[PDB]
Design a protein around this ligand. Structure first.
Ligand SMILES: Cc1nc2c([nH]1)CC[C@@H](N)C2
Ligand SMILES: Cc1nc2c([nH]1)CC[C@@H](N)C2
Lengths: 348, 348, 348, 348, 348
């Protein structure tokens, strides 16, 4: 017996939608939901979505509050809709998927993922919810996450991290590393071997290996010496070159993190969404070196070193395809005289 | 068990709020309420009020659908709020009263008119609803309407017309003429002797007396001759003078109705509300004669003739006070040599 | 001493801005201005302009309430701005000019038209306002209207009609026919010989000549016979042809007026503005004949007959230029075997 | 002589409303007030309230800029309206009270608190303003704050801190500790003995006692040993338990402050208002331990220790009522074998 | 061939408008521009301007991405419009100028600065763009910036810093120090000798001289002793006095930076725009000392010392005019017994 006043009651009393009975007085003014708390209006939600304010309010209240795969993973795996949940995209302040299944009467295309409208869509199934592994077995298309083994299904160990209420973390009290499964046209698909992005921030960047500790602590020329990275253009690619008007390289998040402690810079996130590779309009405050489209990827430094060291440096230019987060990322490799000139996530 | 989805269900299925159980999917976009009817959005209500869209939607759905006193009457009688109903003001497209009693959780100041918050307010009571005559008897301040007699209380016969769903009419299938009662500070008032405005339209003006039939049918100088109105400036006051740049007189609706069949004109309702006297910015299309503030009152022609013929014509200018719709209307009487120059509802 | 509350006071009490002192409480919600009248909000103005709501409110309140030249005339004469007034465009529900001179602090580019910012702009001067004839004499660029003669300047007799509060009319109580003057770069221009559009409505179309009375009263083939219009394609041009899917001709308002009494039709005003020639997407309800762009002009039938009869009918197609409302109107003349096929205001 | 343009002049020149004469050009676009500063619009205020934009602008400009009681105190004391001032709620970006007295023509219910409409409302009086102690003596309901003694009135020493322009602080240059007085139905009410919340932030938490310094500096088991807190479940209640999926305890702000220096966490303020007890949807970033409704109170650690040590630990479960900020806060005390299991601010 | 979908394509692919061909699907909802990225809407721009959302989107995309003069400089130099570029004001989130020249069809007043509409306007010319020095030579009014010498034109060395994408910086990889030129009425104007503001932040304030290092490191009385500033009221002016309810002095940014490390305070930027002198409503959190209008200027401490030491201290009060950023800043100098009492940027 769904209602705006019941959704608001659940938000106010339970912190989110919890199936409780009750109603609070609500007022809707433009794109904001308010509730009366002893005579005055208190803001409950500001709609930042392209959906009607009361509809977005309901989807946000009904968001999955368990650790869930990051939106970039779900997108790279071709997920269209989730089964009986809402994956809230905290990067966009909006639902990650346009439609719902058994969540909200306004956005629902079906009450159950077994209805024929869902057959051509890649439905997201959560093995931690009763009956969802079975629902995935009947689904023509879908992506399944489990905490353990599913008899007969060959698993794909996903990233260590998951999003819990907008917080990307590697769980200690909760499990965040799932097994992944995919189905395309009724056939289970073998998920490729892949690297995973680390999902770290610039403000709170922490090294996750000895190489990463040595990169952040050592000087440029001695880190390169220690790790035998001569001829691999890490000075340009990872460290970044701030000597010319156009900023050179700076494509690994760890190199942006190292620069960040010395001097600050602006990263304009002109397409604010979750993705494996992020494009930024970067302006370095110290030097004034800038770049309109600077592709940045957060790979573990060891993974990036393994990728670049596994390439043939005999051709002037070529497209190098690397599977990261289940998606094929094209990198442009530019070589001269048997050494790397530049290696960057290719701008389409 | 109030909710936006239940109110919308009632609107869609019952034409208005009828206490039925059920919910329809609703979407709110800016100031409009929509409902999904087979995949597409159908508009249910556009908010023209200063209240939040969902709150105004609820008050409109919960409007009184029985013939009720016109807002101008309720306002002239000093009504602040209604007991367990919403008097919808169709002239303003808004609730006639700011707050409610037992109607809507957002606007309610009390669930019952007996709660002390209502004591200082003039509560509107409807004798056609069970218990409201007794609630009025116990209330400190209030206005009561009944279809018949009330033991002990001396009645005041109200206007013949009432508003039914925005349509002002003299009922044939329904009673529209009520008895009026008013209590201030616990004391049953003796309501004054009063004329009533006729609440007619310009497009569908109908005469309600032989004098009114003769006014609309006869030529100016012969109507005045028949009714001995020489020296009362009806040529200026009622007929209107369109010979100069500023339109002369034209203060009685019947005279606007007579002009309307011959030639059209614009009446700019710059304060769109229900009131005993209406101010219009009038532009005559035929002649181009115009007036920024032309006060217009709809009195029965016989009543207006009785008012003007009961005045002393010996002073240049004076304020004439007439009780119309229970309120004191000031008129400006302008005389010269024992004859009327003009007589108009005072602009104050 | 300008203010939102003072402008609202003037609207409420004087019908428009009248320089009176006082303030009323105002509330602004989105694009609507409201005022509190005894506890409740009453709508004073809905902004339909691209200007801020309070700024448009002020310009509308400060509109010229005397008969003024129609916007199409002012536009055809190249008027940019008005001197110390606001010409309200009732067709667009907006000010006719972007900026003001001595009207509103937000839109003013100058307090007086003598300030150098006004020198390159064609300032509209009203000879009925003291000093404006002299201001025009000293202005580099301007358009002047007078009711009578101006010493030295040779007049151009304007159209008989003017707009008074949005009502286009030929004044009887007020003068609406002005003398026109125009100065470009300091030189008093000789305005061209011109026809004038009649500015009539379809709902209340009135004939302004014996030919126009005969057109509306007589049958097609006998009006053409009486006025010797054989070979001039009036059957197609003025009467209109509703026999095919694309509606033929119907370019003179009088012919639309004649059809309107027999059967109704939709005129979609897809560019709602005042102009000499109007484009309509017309759908005939009776036959279903329609046309996406049907140019319609309101010329006096005698003027249109004089124009078409003064053309050479020897070429297949040519552009015929006619001065209407001071502007050059291109028409397309299409002939075959020495007779007109069609003649329509050119779609360019 | 109140106006939008005068309020804006005061904001621009005086930083707030200061009763000065003058006007600046203002433009209102949706919910934002702008002023023209040399050709361009500069934003003066963005409306985050449920009031009309120009009305909220005026109330914000007319906000009390002297140290005033925090909104939670005023709410706990039952304050409805303030006398001749606006208490701006910086937590909600809105006026703390719906209506005003002698502040703004749109929100005013009276010009003076002596008018009968104010009698049933708890009016806030400021003894630092001339005549307000007298006004409180005549008020049927009210809350009075003074800097010193009022003859005959028994005082209540309030919290040390007050809000000055949104900044909660313990004054050094200004007095922030007031005497409190309350009247209910014409009778002065004895304010209960109470603890006061400390109103500290997580980002800038500072200890206000030796116990608080020892809590932040010492290790868990040695702080408990020093202060003889064995059996009082401080490990769960104050320190917090991050070992399970549902976060255990963590109900004192000081314990959140201690965790904050080690590792970060998200506190979703789903009811953003000022209150004695705050509810947060907490997600710990390090462990992934989370809780939908985690009640957090900022008591001085010594005060919290005194409360928990003054309870009988012989019953399985009971409601413990503690007066904090003048309000009775219910705490749920859970005991087993003569020791505390948990003690939390009870979720209604 | 300008379009909303092409501007959005350029934003998405090039980080800004780069003249590329292509279109992306766009959706406009209220004041926000969105683009569809694999089924979902991703926000591209939120309009904070008084221009229509699609028009502001285009101007922002077409912003100058090279280091440009800070808006305060352009304003102080009387710049009205820029030639064939948009100077984005990052302080206001809006275009610095109302109209454009050859940028956007909606805001353009001309396609080239040579058109007569531009003659009376001060056009901003960028010597780094081909043909703009010539355009400045033909311009009746204008401001020119160059990186080097212009034959015959006497230069004015501008500030060391420029804004690059909102980041004020002293360029190392790019040139930020320009030569300035101005023309008024066809005549080149000699730009006065001027000091320049340093454009530093409170959060990241860095000293730019030994005196500034000594000010931040030394104690008050010993800095004054070292620099012989006895009798110059630096204790009040630069250090600030927090002992009374009204905060004393604190008019140099460096003194606010020194206080900021010890204790925090609120600076309410009630006129959020870029200007030489900034007015703040300051509330000191530690003491509670506050000031409604506290003028703050960021001069190099040596420059401020040179200004105050170059004044005659013999008069009680006088206006001291100092050229800063090309504008004449009035300072109020107050002296007693041959010593400074106070010296502040004069509030008009
Ligand atoms: C408004 C008004 N003023 C006057 C009239 N009407 C008519 C008679 C005159 N003495 C003066
Ligand atoms: C638009 C238009 N095109 C034509 C006509 N009208 C009529 C005569 C034909 N020759 C061609």
């Amino acid at each position: 017996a769904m209602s705006l006043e019941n959704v608001a009651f659940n938000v106010v009393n339970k912190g989110h939608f919890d199936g409780q009975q009750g109603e609070v007085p609500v007022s809707i003014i433009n794109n904001t939901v308010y509730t009366k708390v002893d005579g005055v209006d208190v803001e409950l939600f500001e709609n930042k979505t392209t959906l009607p304010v009361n509809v977005a309010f309901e989807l946000w209240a009904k968001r999955n509050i368990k650790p869930v795969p990051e939106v970039k993973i779900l997108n790279n795996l071709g997920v269209d809709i989730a089964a009986n949940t809402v994956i809230w995209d905290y990067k966009r302040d909006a639902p990650a998927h346009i439609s719902t299944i058994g969540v909200c009467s306004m956005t629902d295309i079906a009450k159950k993922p077994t209805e024929t409208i869902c057959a051509p869509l890649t439905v997201f199934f959560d093995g931690r919810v009763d009956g969802q592994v079975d629902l995935f077995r009947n689904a023509r298309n879908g992506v399944l996450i489990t905490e353990g083994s599913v008899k007969g299904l060959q698993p794909s160990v996903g990233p260590k991290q998951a999003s819990l209420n907008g917080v990307t973390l590697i769980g200690e009290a909760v499990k965040t590393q799932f097994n992944y499964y995919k189905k395309v046209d009724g056939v289970v698909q073998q998920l490729p071997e892949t690297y995973f992005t680390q999902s770290r921030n610039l403000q709170e960047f922490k090294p996750r290996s000895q190489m990463e500790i040595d990169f952040l602590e050592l000087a440029m020329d001695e880190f390169i010496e220690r790790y035998k990275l001569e001829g691999y253009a890490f000075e340009h690619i990872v460290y970044g070159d701030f000597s010319h008007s156009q900023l050179g390289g700076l494509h690994l998040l760890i190199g942006l993190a190292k620069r960040f402690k010395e001097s600050p810079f602006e990263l304009e996130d002109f397409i604010p969404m979750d993705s494996t590779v992020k494009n930024y309009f970067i302006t370095d405050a110290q030097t004034g070196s800038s770049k309109c489209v600077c592709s940045v990827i957060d790979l573990l430094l060891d993974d990036f070193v393994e990728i670049i060291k596994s390439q043939d440096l005999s051709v002037v230019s070529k497209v190098v395809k690397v599977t990261i987060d289940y998606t094929e990322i094209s990198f442009m490799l530019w070589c001269k005289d048997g050494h790397v000139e530049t290696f960057y996530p290719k701008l389409q």
